[PDB]
Amino acid sequence: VQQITLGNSTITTQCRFYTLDSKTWTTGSKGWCWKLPDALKDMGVFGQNMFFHSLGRSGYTVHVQCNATKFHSGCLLVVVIPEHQLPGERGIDLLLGNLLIFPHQFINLRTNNTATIVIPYINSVPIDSMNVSLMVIPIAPLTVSLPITVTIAPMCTEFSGIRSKSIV
């Protein structure tokens, strides 16, 4: 219904949930950018498996929710770019019209306050050393700041068999 529980975590919105630090959307902010899995390199048990195993493979489900009242205006564009080119769990605090080609889900405070994106593993090799970058851009400015919460759930994750192989 509205209480998705995954592993030892529980979230309310409409394999565990890692909630990154809540960002403050002020009227002059350009947006934010989080490379994956780099945003989870320090994130408990995932950060340990990611460092310990030489190669890995993971999908992600990103829930971006902006807790606010029904009085605020403005809209954010949450877009995931595969293989973005020229930070940790703190992200990168910051043509645009063409970014809609990439999987996206506009949040518009007038109508919506949540966006959910299921990201599959996208690479030119089946397994790789631990790739995609999530960006949150405020398009229409905020008229009354408002908190932005990013929740990443890595799912369907596999890692290499080496260091666990017996030589007999």
Binding site: Q2, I11, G44, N67
Partner: peptide
């Protein structure tokens, strides 16, 4: 707190 057992609770929603 978030790393261990926990429930994220939106007060406005519930």
């Amino acid at each position: 707190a978030m790393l261990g057992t926990h429930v994220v609770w939106d007060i406005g929603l519930q």
